Amino acid sequence: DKDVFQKFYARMLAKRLIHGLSMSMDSEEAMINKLKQACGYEFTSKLHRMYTDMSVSADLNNKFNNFIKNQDTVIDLGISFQIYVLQAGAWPLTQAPSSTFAIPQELEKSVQMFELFYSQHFSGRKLTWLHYLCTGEVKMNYLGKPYVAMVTTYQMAVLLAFNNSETVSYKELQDSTQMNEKELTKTIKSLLDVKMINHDSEKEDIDAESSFSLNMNFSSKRTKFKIT
């Protein structure tokens, strides 16, 4: 049953390419081409579309950068905006978008600008953002030592509501992100694993009442680290 092997490969090739980790990009081309030799083109027609997008990724970021550089108005994104679009009918990222979410105003300027570029560079291609794979560097310098943390959009969204005020109640937290509640339970406790935010509430568990406060004495051996 080679059909189930592709499903377990596409579901995990997507994990390998989306996080920027790979032994060498030529080998990924070499590997996909060899599976095509084994089971024909149609076996790897989807997997060949996993590739030929990272190659276009650099060919699209510069065009978008050339677009914003050659703009009538002066627009600054304020962050290293790296973008690469993926064909919806190929990658196995069909996870339910039922959990609605809206990024705050700091990152809202950059996300809307690329849609304007995409709507005119390509015709009829709508953009459905997958916020659970977008990871970006955030200036973590509210404490004395400016540490660097690798967080996702969902992880940053809760953290972004705490940059303006060091103590924001969970009632405001659960409404500022307007996201799903059952997955919100594991959203913040992931930070507690790396002790980003102290459990201000006296309750052992985390609920709507569990108001939190930023950690003053956070220390890390490595300045740049991965949060799991």
Binding site: I18, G20, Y41, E42, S45, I79, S80, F81, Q82, I83, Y84, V85, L86, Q87, A88, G89, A90, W91, L93, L107, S110, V111, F114, Y118, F122, S123, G124, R125, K126, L127, T128, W129, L130, L133, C134, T135, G136, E137, T153
Partner: protein
């Protein structure tokens, strides 16, 4: 910020009615012969009736009948992909 967006065509039908394949994928003509030769030019063409088909599918359909396959209305192209 390293962001990822899943691009797709804004049709709501999600199925080309000529080849019966998923509209994001290749058309049946590109999937048969041009599967190993050249497959990057299989775009989607809309119409006045807001029905979008694979461009190879709708161009092949127009060589016999000049009506929209879904509803028997005169077919005039509205938008392409380029």
């Amino acid at each position: 910020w390293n962001a990822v967006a899943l691009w797709a065509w804004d049709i709501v039908v999600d199925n080309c009615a000529i080849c019966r394949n998923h509209i994001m994928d290749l058309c049946i003509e590109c999937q048969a012969n041009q599967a190993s030769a050249t497959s990057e030019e299989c775009t989607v063409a809309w119409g006045v009736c807001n029905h979008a088909f694979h461009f190879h599918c709708i161009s092949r359909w127009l060589k016999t009948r000049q009506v929209c396959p879904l509803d028997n209305r005169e077919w005039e192209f509205q938008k392409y992909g380029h």
